[PDB]
Amino acid sequence: ASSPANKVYQDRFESMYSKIKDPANGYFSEQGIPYHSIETLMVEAPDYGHVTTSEAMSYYMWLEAMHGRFSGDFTGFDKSWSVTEQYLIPTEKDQPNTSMSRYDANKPATYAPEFQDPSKYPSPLDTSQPVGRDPINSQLTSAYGTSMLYGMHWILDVDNWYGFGARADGTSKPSYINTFQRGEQESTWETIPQPCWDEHKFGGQYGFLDLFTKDTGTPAKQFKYTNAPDADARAVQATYWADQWAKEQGKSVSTSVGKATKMGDYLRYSFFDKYFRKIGQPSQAGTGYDAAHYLLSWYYAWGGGIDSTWSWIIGSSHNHFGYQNPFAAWVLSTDANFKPKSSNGASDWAKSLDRQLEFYQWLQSAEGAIAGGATNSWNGRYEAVPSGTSTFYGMGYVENPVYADPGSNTWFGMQVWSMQRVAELYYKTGDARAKKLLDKWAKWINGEIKFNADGTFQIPSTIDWEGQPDTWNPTQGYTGNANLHVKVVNYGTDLGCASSLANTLTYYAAKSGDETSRQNAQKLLDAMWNNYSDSKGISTVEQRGDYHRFLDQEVFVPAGWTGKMPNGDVIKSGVKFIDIRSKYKQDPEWQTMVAALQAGQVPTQRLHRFWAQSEFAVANGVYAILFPD
Ligand SMILES: OC[C@H]1O[C@@H](O[C@H]2[C@H](O)[C@@H](O)[C@H](O)O[C@@H]2CO)[C@H](O)[C@@H](O)[C@@H]1O
Ligand SMILES: [Ca+2]
């Protein structure tokens, strides 16, 4: 029997759960897939409200796990896993084993440089540049009996809004698509949405392929998928809690545990340098594990031929603290129920847990906020790490890993999403490393929460950085990073971030006994319930400062290249964001937004992001469980 829960907060979770699952609210598609947001005019990471992400799926799992905890019904949790496997993990038809089985572990992929401006793309492939070897593929094919990868592709056009369809049919839904392909300066506003399955039926003469990669020969028809490691790890984290909660009530989610475990086994591809180069000695091809940084990097990607048989797999050299999940690492390396089938699965995750905790500590600023991360590929071309750039296992520090428009570590959300996982680990194990990190981080953020007399509140929104951490010496440990500082640029009322903050503070307060953290968590939860509730969950009005880019952001198209989007929009040099997404003019909020831009005003919106609503619901359940009285 599960322990008693605080009835007040349990009721708030149930109310939110009902609002999120209410078909009249429109959070899900007819196929049962949650959208990024109810509203369609949405550009921030995905560029359309009704595309979904693996991130949304992992929140859907967490939400359903918590619901099973309170209702004793776990069929919704099992359903979230069925939808994920059916629509987000490429099937046999999507990643033909005929091509995947032709993968060569001694030559995983062909090197191509990364550039700091989208105008330098397509990037030319170079077969003469060294590529290390993949030590885990043989472990995976042996344990699972297939060459296909079991991980979630990160973004999905749920209703086929772009019109690419399934496997080039232009008519089916959902539709696998990808966006980001052109480096750190390619914001969400500067991409050319493309299909994952490219048969050359849309776009230009060779589909969209030669917009990104240049080869000596003619581009072949091919598929390609990209994983978002933080989402796959959150799926493991959510499944662990569903397994614990189910077992307390004599129920079982055995089948979902096996999928989560298999996913965590493949998730190890993110522990490796993009082209399997040695960590700390980027000019040399790796010989196996010497190319493993053991951190959850920006992505792992894979693809292969459609009409000819071949394939490739890449990891990522860039690491952001925001993606780490020491809790998922603890689960996969110590819990017998989640022991991966592969030979080195559990032990690699045990190595990741230690390395992740070292990474967080190395990045902790003088004040307490966690700085960006590190890369094993300077400028994405394995260049020499400049002057006295501090390093972590030979990897140079980067303030904003991967993206600079805007900087990936300028959003406060990374702080809470990542530290929440550290709080869960500390709660479960009492780990000293987790405690040291949290004691300092919590003290910082507790001094940044502002409560107003009218019930509203504000938390850090945009942050900035100065300096760099001291070079990591594993034996000396934390130096205090006196020359690394965080600065809060502006405050706001991001409800998803505040909910994630409440969650982190709740786990931390339950273990440490820190009253300040417990009352700030409850006050955040109460303030949101009382002052921001609406018929769809919670919401507030926010300014969309970058929406002017809808009309004035030019998209780079290489000289001489012309193509068409499925709806007929012409892709050619000179196009703006809106020119290759003309369907946006039919959005119900379009006139309102343009009218605001015309009047010289910053557009505002009241948004219902699926992850934020789920984050709030989960935060209430966590508090109900940890603080019953
Ligand atoms: O890319 C991180 C994360 O961003 C989320 O959107 C943020 C956006 O980055 C920020 O500029 C704006 O102020 O707030 C929104 C909402 O928090 C996005 O919703 C996530 O899917 C994405 O992973
Ligand atoms: Ca840019």
Coordinates of N, CA and C and ligand atoms in Angstrom, one line a residue, residues 117-118 184-187 190 405 549 553, ligand 2:
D117 N 28.1 29.9 -39.3 CA 27.2 30.7 -40.0 C 26.5 29.8 -41.0
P118 N 25.1 29.8 -41.1 CA 24.4 28.9 -42.0 C 24.8 29.1 -43.5
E184 N 25.5 26.5 -34.9 CA 25.2 27.4 -33.8 C 24.4 28.6 -34.1
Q185 N 24.6 29.2 -35.3 CA 23.9 30.4 -35.6 C 22.5 30.2 -36.3
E186 N 22.1 28.9 -36.5 CA 20.9 28.6 -37.1 C 19.8 28.5 -36.1
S187 N 19.1 29.6 -35.8 CA 18.0 29.7 -34.9 C 16.8 28.9 -35.4
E190 N 15.6 30.3 -38.7 CA 16.5 30.1 -39.9 C 16.6 28.8 -40.5
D405 N 22.0 31.4 -30.9 CA 20.9 32.3 -31.3 C 19.5 31.8 -30.9
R549 N 10.7 38.2 -36.2 CA 11.4 37.4 -37.2 C 10.5 36.6 -38.1
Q553 N 13.1 37.8 -40.9 CA 14.2 36.9 -40.8 C 14.4 36.2 -42.2
Ligands
CA2 CA 21.3 33.5 -36.7

